[model samples]
Target chain A: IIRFSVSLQQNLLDELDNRIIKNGYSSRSELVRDMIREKLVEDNWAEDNPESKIAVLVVIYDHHQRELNQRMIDIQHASGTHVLCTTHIHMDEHNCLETIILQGNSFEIQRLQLEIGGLRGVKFAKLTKAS
Target chain B: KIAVLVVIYDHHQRELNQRMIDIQHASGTHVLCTTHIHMDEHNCLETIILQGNSFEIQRLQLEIGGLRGVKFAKLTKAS
Candidate 1:
């Protein structure tokens, strides 16, 4: 078994703890696991080829913004990547949520996330590296 | 006119979209347009263009923002 300890600056540790509590994380291990996974995804994406296929970029954004949703889809279509599918729900009268599954180069996937997230009315932008 | 846009999760929440449309029609707010963009196999994006008293648009945003699975929300000025 391998075990290691990581030290954080006092102020940074305080902020991390605060986020843990705010996000209802059960333990430091759990939070750190997610952080590690995030870093792994970032590193893999950064090293992958631009034209490689078989990757996904999941995102969340406001649906009520004019052209924003369509713009995302349009970009996906133009990227030469395969869009496996997409799912959606009307959250309320004014809000809607969506998740898209796509297959493409890791670089393209990351690029798409940045493009979609930069839209004018998207409030939350999260990208989950799909298996 | 001003309107707020929100994005959230409504997985298997059947008729949720219909309910939203019904509310807008009855709220004396004019819905200029609406669109749905599928996000993936489990999520969606619904866009609503509301034209009415600016205050009412805000009211609609607040009321809908309280719904379940609404992970994100934003308000903006219409072009």
Candidate 2:
């Protein structure tokens, strides 16, 4: 176990305490651990090889955009990697959201995200990984 | 106008970053501002605010999303 003390203004302390209660933390230790975990998840992708772990990439797109739908498929197919599966949902007449599970090192996965996420028809893309 | 908060793995994805700028230009949107904070040595959270009509902004988001190294990009409604 580790222990440390932080110095802050009274108002800041009050706000911190409020957050501790609102977020259902029993103690500062719990909150700090949660913060660490969030940091760890971020670190996992810092790897040059992002594909060695488990990762998920989410992309939102407009299907009606010129040639975008076909481009999405082409990118995934050309990736030449293991795509565990892909879940596509029609968000609306125009919006289509897809979540793709990729099994590889962190690096490979992140590259795929950049390729797919940067496509002209995609509205948004998010990449996540767990160690 | 819409802005997106992007949580990416790192600053090393050179191609991806360039693509983001390219998309904004191609879509003819105003990229209001972008701020990035290091989540760790390897990850960074970048918040980019864009101003344009819905179609142009949406297209910009898509183009950025399709980049290879960009892990996560989230768009929020900007005031």
Considering every candidate listed, which one attains the maximal TM-score? 2
How much is the lDDT of residue A65 in candidate 2?
89
Residue-wise C-alpha lDDT for candidate 2, range A1-131, written one tens digit per residue: 56888778999878878987664445666555546655777776675532356555656788878887778677767765566666665656977656565666666666788887778877787765644
TM-score of 2: 0.50
lDDT of 1 at A29: 68
* Model 2, runs deviating above 4 Å: A1-27, A48-51, B1-79
Alpha carbon lDDT at A9, candidate 1: 94
- Give the docking tier of candidate 2: incorrect
Q: What is the C-alpha lDDT profile of model 1 across A13-96, one tens digit per residue?
A: 999999877655566765675566457645766675544433333344566678987787798777767776555645456655
- The reply for model 1, stretches above 4 Å from the true place, is A9-15, A50-70, A118-125, B1-79
